[PDB]
């Protein structure tokens, strides 16, 4: 480009791939959120938690697209695969799937950071450090805290514990 | 000193010892607080309770140091031993350890009050009565109230009770 | 851990070591502060300067502990050695000791940054860059500015200069 | 009296003696204050410091008189001796005389506390602890801090140091 400088084709392509991963994650969270709004699941706080994450992941994709243009690369969109499940089980099952999803996004961020470091692209590396790495660490810690609280509440009364977690930890309304 | 009056070497030394005990207690509460912030423990209200106590105990040490100087004694600092445990078990185990810790500080306050009385040092005795004795009694009563509520919640569903205590009694977010 | 990702045992251990160093530094500043509150030293602005630094260093330790948990490592506390001196001499002597202390913390930060870089741990590296490296550079510059002003004020009237520095540069009030 | 209870003649008399000592001290501070307002001394901050202390000492006498009546004793006033000096020398000389005066009041408070303790008069003991003992300790610490700063400022330029202390430490504006 007329503005492109120190921006490799390898980073440009990995950025487009990462946009796809973030949009896939956003779509997964849309499905999780609406599952918990089903009349036969009915856990409002869990629904809201996952709908909020759908928006957060979309915003990540949007920031990557802004950056792609700021650097002179070209956004390229690919098909977005549907989420891995149509029904997400219990809050525990869903929170486990979300932590798996987030670890996968985190590894993709770390892989892209390493590519940027290898390509001597400090703007890329700073961008990820400033807007993605700590955001992801914070979210994974929150999800782990949630998992431990959900697990402690299973005991021998799973329904009671799932209700109490939704009412007393998750935001509702 | 040019200001020292009615201030025995015995009281001066016991004051320095008490500073060490309060800082040791503060450090114990720092460890308790961060244990409960672990992703595999995740009891925010318990963490906050103990972090608040770390600050309270530090403030006690600071008041003793201010007083030492007001009286013309000389602060002398010693090594601070690490807390007695690296992992603190359940909320019940932790609250039991805290009550044991507080009873030990209380006995040290009472011992110092008795030394002051024996040395006819009424400023020392008033200082402890005004800023430490009732504060400690109030805290031990609160901890006993907490212990009884934690114990009543164990029954046959320990995880459920530990979650409910943290959510409905301890401050969180 | 269930959340731990890209977090080496080497970094986890060095983080615990750094917490010990920050708490040791905090304790050193507590001793410096109270020394200057002695009736036979009586330099309020110097006392306040060092008590403020005790709090700053504690806050550094607290941030490291928060981060340790965010990453899935485990805080491990060790004994805290007492400060290197019981009496700190003149304001000049104290400011010299503080700059030596700060350079030692700075080198520990740089060493940990290098370990993080070697381990491809960009979250660690960003954390130090964002919350510690510049804070330390700013503080060392301030301390050097203070040292030069204290030194210029010694001349042939040391007491006069020590009073004037405390009154016209250091905060009191 | 119709209200007197647990109030010994020994305490009643010592209270009257202590009123005399506080009024004597108040008169000493009036003389110190006006000395420093002389056109050939002219240290406004020193004058104000001592005039404020004249009022503080009077207020102590007034509290003792209120208490004497609250307890059913009878105030008995005696002649008030003039201060020990007509001219008070330098700020250093004056601050030294004031610390000597305050130590004498402090010992009288401690002696009265001991008499009250010996007579099992806890209202007397509490009264002194609540309104006199710590007030006196705080004031003596302030005076010692002042003495150390005045002494550090003497060096080889006494006039310069006396001016700077009055301008930068004592209240004026
Ligand atoms: Cl296609
Ligand atoms: Cl040692
Ligand atoms: Cl050990
Ligand atoms: Cl007469």
From Swiss-Prot, chains A, B, C, D:
<dbReference type="Pfam" id="PF00210">
    <property type="entry name" value="Ferritin"/>
</dbReference>
<dbReference type="GO" id="GO:0006826">
    <property type="term" value="P:iron ion transport"/>
</dbReference>
<dbReference type="InterPro" id="IPR012347">
    <property type="entry name" value="Ferritin-like"/>
</dbReference>
<keyword id="KW-0479">Metal-binding</keyword>
<feature type="binding site">
    <location>
        <position position="55"/>
    </location>
    <ligand>
        <name>Fe cation</name>
    </ligand>
</feature>
<keyword id="KW-0408">Iron</keyword>
<feature type="domain" description="Ferritin-like diiron">
    <location>
        <begin position="5"/>
        <end position="154"/>
    </location>
</feature>
<dbReference type="GO" id="GO:0070288">
    <property type="term" value="C:ferritin complex"/>
</dbReference>
<dbReference type="InterPro" id="IPR009078">
    <property type="entry name" value="Ferritin-like_SF"/>
</dbReference>
<keyword id="KW-0968">Cytoplasmic vesicle</keyword>
<keyword id="KW-0409">Iron storage</keyword>
<comment type="subunit">
    <text>Oligomer of 24 subunits. There are two types of subunits: L (light) chain and H (heavy) chain. The major chain can be light or heavy, depending on the species and tissue type. The functional molecule forms a roughly spherical shell with a diameter of 12 nm and contains a central cavity into which the insoluble mineral iron core is deposited. Interacts with NCOA4.</text>
</comment>
<feature type="binding site">
    <location>
        <position position="52"/>
    </location>
    <ligand>
        <name>Fe cation</name>
    </ligand>
</feature>
<dbReference type="GO" id="GO:0031410">
    <property type="term" value="C:cytoplasmic vesicle"/>
</dbReference>
<protein>
    <recommendedName>
        <fullName>Ferritin light chain</fullName>
    </recommendedName>
</protein>
<feature type="binding site">
    <location>
        <position position="62"/>
    </location>
    <ligand>
        <name>Fe cation</name>
    </ligand>
</feature>
<feature type="binding site">
    <location>
        <position position="59"/>
    </location>
    <ligand>
        <name>Fe cation</name>
    </ligand>
</feature>
<dbReference type="InterPro" id="IPR014034">
    <property type="entry name" value="Ferritin_CS"/>
</dbReference>
<dbReference type="GO" id="GO:0005506">
    <property type="term" value="F:iron ion binding"/>
</dbReference>
<comment type="function">
    <text>Stores iron in a soluble, non-toxic, readily available form. Important for iron homeostasis. Iron is taken up in the ferrous form and deposited as ferric hydroxides after oxidation. Also plays a role in delivery of iron to cells. Mediates iron uptake in capsule cells of the developing kidney. Delivery to lysosomes by the cargo receptor NCOA4 for autophagic degradation and release or iron.</text>
</comment>
<keyword id="KW-0963">Cytoplasm</keyword>
<dbReference type="InterPro" id="IPR009040">
    <property type="entry name" value="Ferritin-like_diiron"/>
</dbReference>
<comment type="similarity">
    <text>Belongs to the ferritin family.</text>
</comment>
<dbReference type="InterPro" id="IPR001519">
    <property type="entry name" value="Ferritin"/>
</dbReference>
<dbReference type="InterPro" id="IPR008331">
    <property type="entry name" value="Ferritin_DPS_dom"/>
</dbReference>
<feature type="binding site">
    <location>
        <position position="56"/>
    </location>
    <ligand>
        <name>Fe cation</name>
    </ligand>
</feature>
<dbReference type="GO" id="GO:0008198">
    <property type="term" value="F:ferrous iron binding"/>
</dbReference>
<dbReference type="GO" id="GO:0006879">
    <property type="term" value="P:intracellular iron ion homeostasis"/>
</dbReference>
<dbReference type="GO" id="GO:0044754">
    <property type="term" value="C:autolysosome"/>
</dbReference>
<dbReference type="GO" id="GO:0005737">
    <property type="term" value="C:cytoplasm"/>
</dbReference>
<keyword id="KW-0007">Acetylation</keyword>
<dbReference type="GO" id="GO:0008199">
    <property type="term" value="F:ferric iron binding"/>
</dbReference>
<feature type="region of interest" description="Catalytic site for iron oxidation">
    <location>
        <begin position="52"/>
        <end position="59"/>
    </location>
</feature>
<keyword id="KW-0458">Lysosome</keyword>
<dbReference type="GO" id="GO:0005776">
    <property type="term" value="C:autophagosome"/>
</dbReference>
